[PDB]
Design an enzyme around this catalytic site. Sequence first.
Site, mmCIF file in Angstrom:
data_model
loop_
_atom_site.group_PDB
_atom_site.id
_atom_site.type_symbol
_atom_site.label_atom_id
_atom_site.label_comp_id
_atom_site.label_asym_id
_atom_site.label_seq_id
_atom_site.Cartn_x
_atom_site.Cartn_y
_atom_site.Cartn_z
ATOM 1 N N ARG A 55 0.857 -1.210 0.000
ATOM 2 C CA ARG A 55 0.000 0.000 0.000
ATOM 3 C C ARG A 55 0.861 1.215 0.000
ATOM 4 O O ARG A 55 1.572 1.489 0.972
ATOM 5 C CB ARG A 55 -0.992 -0.069 1.187
ATOM 6 C CG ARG A 55 -1.944 1.127 1.190
ATOM 7 C CD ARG A 55 -3.177 0.828 2.094
ATOM 8 N NE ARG A 55 -3.324 1.864 3.086
ATOM 9 C CZ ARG A 55 -4.254 2.827 3.078
ATOM 10 N NH1 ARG A 55 -5.218 2.942 2.115
ATOM 11 N NH2 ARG A 55 -4.196 3.703 4.048
ATOM 12 N N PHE A 60 1.517 10.616 1.434
ATOM 13 C CA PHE A 60 1.039 10.054 2.690
ATOM 14 C C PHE A 60 2.101 9.113 3.267
ATOM 15 O O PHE A 60 2.808 9.465 4.239
ATOM 16 C CB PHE A 60 -0.350 9.415 2.506
ATOM 17 C CG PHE A 60 -0.960 8.832 3.763
ATOM 18 C CD1 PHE A 60 -0.450 9.194 5.047
ATOM 19 C CD2 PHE A 60 -2.104 7.987 3.657
ATOM 20 C CE1 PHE A 60 -1.042 8.630 6.219
ATOM 21 C CE2 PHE A 60 -2.691 7.444 4.796
ATOM 22 C CZ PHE A 60 -2.185 7.766 6.077
ATOM 23 N N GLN A 63 3.501 1.565 2.997
ATOM 24 C CA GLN A 63 3.213 0.574 4.056
ATOM 25 C C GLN A 63 3.698 -0.827 3.613
ATOM 26 O O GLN A 63 3.389 -1.263 2.518
ATOM 27 C CB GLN A 63 1.721 0.564 4.358
ATOM 28 C CG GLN A 63 1.338 -0.411 5.439
ATOM 29 C CD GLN A 63 -0.174 -0.364 5.805
ATOM 30 O OE1 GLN A 63 -0.856 0.599 5.471
ATOM 31 N NE2 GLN A 63 -0.658 -1.369 6.543
ATOM 32 N N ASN A 102 -1.602 -0.659 12.728
ATOM 33 C CA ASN A 102 -2.367 -1.358 13.727
ATOM 34 C C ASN A 102 -3.842 -1.292 13.342
ATOM 35 O O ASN A 102 -4.229 -0.500 12.435
ATOM 36 C CB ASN A 102 -2.134 -0.890 15.179
ATOM 37 C CG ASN A 102 -2.597 0.524 15.422
ATOM 38 O OD1 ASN A 102 -1.867 1.348 15.990
ATOM 39 N ND2 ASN A 102 -3.830 0.775 15.142
ATOM 40 N N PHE A 113 4.704 1.477 8.567
ATOM 41 C CA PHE A 113 4.735 2.401 7.421
ATOM 42 C C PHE A 113 5.866 3.431 7.533
ATOM 43 O O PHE A 113 6.312 3.745 8.666
ATOM 44 C CB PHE A 113 3.339 3.056 7.240
ATOM 45 C CG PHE A 113 2.869 3.864 8.465
ATOM 46 C CD1 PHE A 113 2.205 3.169 9.518
ATOM 47 C CD2 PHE A 113 2.885 5.288 8.522
ATOM 48 C CE1 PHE A 113 1.725 3.817 10.615
ATOM 49 C CE2 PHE A 113 2.449 5.959 9.679
ATOM 50 C CZ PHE A 113 1.759 5.200 10.723
ATOM 51 N N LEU A 122 -2.012 10.792 13.582
ATOM 52 C CA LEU A 122 -1.661 9.463 14.078
ATOM 53 C C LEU A 122 -0.936 9.542 15.402
ATOM 54 O O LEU A 122 -0.758 8.476 16.028
ATOM 55 C CB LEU A 122 -0.835 8.664 13.043
ATOM 56 C CG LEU A 122 -1.496 8.536 11.677
ATOM 57 C CD1 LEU A 122 -0.532 7.992 10.630
ATOM 58 C CD2 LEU A 122 -2.842 7.840 11.735
ATOM 59 N N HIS A 126 -0.433 5.541 16.750
ATOM 60 C CA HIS A 126 0.529 4.625 16.147
ATOM 61 C C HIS A 126 1.854 4.845 16.787
ATOM 62 O O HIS A 126 2.217 5.988 17.064
ATOM 63 C CB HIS A 126 0.623 4.811 14.682
ATOM 64 C CG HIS A 126 -0.665 4.433 13.999
ATOM 65 N ND1 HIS A 126 -0.880 3.150 13.494
ATOM 66 C CD2 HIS A 126 -1.854 5.066 13.947
ATOM 67 C CE1 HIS A 126 -2.139 3.084 13.024
ATOM 68 N NE2 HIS A 126 -2.722 4.261 13.241
HETATM 69 N N1 UNU Z 1 -4.303 1.717 10.324
HETATM 70 C C1 UNU Z 1 -3.011 1.583 9.925
HETATM 71 O O1 UNU Z 1 -2.400 0.592 10.152
HETATM 72 C C2 UNU Z 1 -2.343 2.669 9.197
HETATM 73 C C3 UNU Z 1 -1.315 2.358 8.327
HETATM 74 C C4 UNU Z 1 -0.705 3.457 7.685
HETATM 75 C C5 UNU Z 1 -1.003 4.807 7.999
HETATM 76 C C6 UNU Z 1 -2.032 5.093 8.906
HETATM 77 C C7 UNU Z 1 -2.670 3.998 9.546
#
Ligand code: UNU
Length: 165
Positions: A55, A60, A63, A102, A113, A122, A126
């Site tokens: 992804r 942004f 990932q 997560n 990521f 975040l 995160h």
């Molecule tokens: N929900 C996630 O894992 C996520 C991954 C990448 C960026 C923001 C969130």
Amino acid sequence: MVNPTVFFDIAVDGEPLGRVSFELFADKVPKTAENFRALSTGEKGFGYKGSCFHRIIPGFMCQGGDFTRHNGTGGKSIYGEKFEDENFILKHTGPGILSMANAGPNTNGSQFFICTAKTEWLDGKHVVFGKVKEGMNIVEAMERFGSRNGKTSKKITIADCGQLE
Ligand SMILES: NC(=O)c1ccccc1
């Protein structure tokens, strides 16, 4: 103890692109840093080598880390399927930040990521645990193979990875 450094050698459709290296903030988030370090050397018998960045969304993040389902639905930590949020001392301050994916509180696995923009919404949700040290140009090159919905136009893989001295 110096913070460990890990490298990924990135490939695009199997063609070598370059090396990205990361400092892992073991001084701040030892458990989370350790997880990423060991998945990067493969020393537990599993890890990131050969997996892809499934992804990627320009402006942004990129990932990856899902080496069991290859699509964002899998992966596992070195502690069990999932582990707790260690702390939120470090914030998403800009491009290059390394943070754990997560699906809710206390659900860290192997997926992570690399930020290509500031993602401050975040913070506190995160766990940040490292940063790109060398090869942010390689991360920028990676990111051009993403798209708005995060599907990649070529396969972006971790051809090799490990710990640097
Ligand atoms: N929900 C996630 O894992 C996520 C991954 C990448 C960026 C923001 C969130």
